[PDB]
């Protein structure tokens, strides 16, 4: 398929710089303008600029002019966006997006990269401690019980939670993280299951916090 895969989430101290990557596959990278659009958490979309991967020309929003740099490596079909002198209001999800339109004035931004969360902060990266959430044991013999994983004390966002390596998708709820007074995040991934499978089937959650390269395949059992 036509897709754009971006580098992982990162934390950067104020005043530092960040470089986000974007690898294009399924189409001739050199043939289409590449755009970057960021989104501060909860807010809207803000356009930063574009690059012509063929000629190497660029065009930046005047808001970012003297502070952003866009480049590309055609030998590996990768685009890059570097933002310097980072401040707290630069914390945002940074998106890759190709302009699939051949008109001189239309922009048809399709497809979009998955996004890179860049967190601007002086705090250090910390992996999560993953704890189990065991069924109440009471339950209803002919019903459904709940079990989950507690992903606690990590920084920066995000963590990704899977269950049984993606085999278990129904009834899964990974809640939004919550910021504790300590500056660390915490969330919960739960799943509802039939009370019969509690004694037979084994459920293991698959937490992954890439900013610290932490991976915990925790098994949940009463």
């Amino acid at each position: 398929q036509v897709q754009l895969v971006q580098s992982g989430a990162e934390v950067k101290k104020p005043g530092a710089s960040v470089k986000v990557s974007c690898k294009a596959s399924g189409y001739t990278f050199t043939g289409y303008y590449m755009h970057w659009v960021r989104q501060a958490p909860g807010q809207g979309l803000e356009w930063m600029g574009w690059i012509n991967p063929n000629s190497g020309g660029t065009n930046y929003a005047q808001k970012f002019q003297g502070r952003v740099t866009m480049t590309r490596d055609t030998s590996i079909s990768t685009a890059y966006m570097e933002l310097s002198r980072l401040r707290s209001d630069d914390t945002a999800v940074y998106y890759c997006a190709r302009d699939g339109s051949g008109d001189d004035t239309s922009w048809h931004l399709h497809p979009w990269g998955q996004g890179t969360l860049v967190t601007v902060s002086s705090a250090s990266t910390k992996g999560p401690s993953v704890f189990p959430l065991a069924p109440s044991s009471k339950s209803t013999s002919g019903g459904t019980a709940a079990l989950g994983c507690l992903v606690k004390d990590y920084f920066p966002e995000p963590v990704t939670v899977s269950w049984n390596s993606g085999a278990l998708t129904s009834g899964v709820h990974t809640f939004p993280a919550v910021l504790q007074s300590s500056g660390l995040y915490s969330l919960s991934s739960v799943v509802t299951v039939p009370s019969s499978s509690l004694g037979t089937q084994t459920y293991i959650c698959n937490v992954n916090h890439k900013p610290s390269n932490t991976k915990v395949d925790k098994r949940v059992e009463p």
């Binding site: 809207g44 979309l45 922009w107 399709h110 704890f131 606690k152 919550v178």
Partner: protein
């Protein structure tokens, strides 16, 4: 240079409804308006380009029309997965977004409680979790009872976005306690009041 406005800011409709939202441009932009859809946690998706052209691969219930300054975007039959924020855009300028929610029948929460794990007690913290699963409407109250004593100031909550399949909400409350405080008591309970319940529901554990 170009100011984009959208209306309504938010809306709640029912599965099957014909939903239309609007976008206005500070100046005449002919039919150069595009509409992007953004589901919580995902990237925007192009759905309509040049005001009325449906992007390949997008369902046919999505449409668009308008030329000049005023435009509309339409969902001929709202589907449960159509919950999202919809942004109009022309060139570099994005509209503020319209959020579409779904109104649904009432659904009572499946309440669950989890005591702290033994591993976490080694650390000196006690996290008691309480889960309200797939309910509607979104409003819900959670009161913690540490030992028949109504707790406060030591609970953090988190709610999920409307489910793409059944349009329900799930909530997760966490009571965080000093392990020194967690051992001195034994009757820990999570009381849940929701419209879908005839009476408040309480799930407890011991130890």
């Amino acid at each position: 240079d170009i100011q984009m406005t959208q209306s309504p800011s938010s809306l709640s409709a029912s599965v099957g409804d014909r939903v239309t939202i609007t976008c206005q441009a500070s100046q005449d932009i002919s039919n150069y308006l595009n509409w992007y859809q953004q589901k919580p946690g995902k990237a925007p998706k192009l759905l309509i380009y040049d005001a009325s052209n449906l992007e390949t691969g997008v369902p046919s219930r999505f449409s668009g029309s308008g030329s000049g300054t005023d435009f509309t975007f339409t969902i001929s039959s709202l589907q449960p997965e159509d919950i999202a924020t919809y942004y109009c855009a022309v060139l570099e300028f994005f509209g503020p977004g319209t959020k579409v929610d779904i109104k649904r029948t009432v659904a009572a929460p499946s309440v669950f409680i989890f005591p702290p794990s033994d591993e976490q007690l080694k650390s000196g913290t006690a996290s008691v979790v309480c889960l309200l699963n797939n309910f509607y409407p979104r409003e819900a109250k959670v009161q913690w009872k540490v030992d028949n004593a109504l707790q406060s100031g030591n609970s953090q909550e988190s709610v999920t976005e409307q489910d793409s399949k059944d349009s329900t909400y799930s909530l997760s409350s966490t009571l965080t306690l000093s392990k020194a405080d967690y051992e001195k008591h034994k009757v820990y309970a999570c009381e849940v009041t929701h419209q879908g319940l005839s009476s408040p529901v309480t799930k407890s554990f011991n130890r």
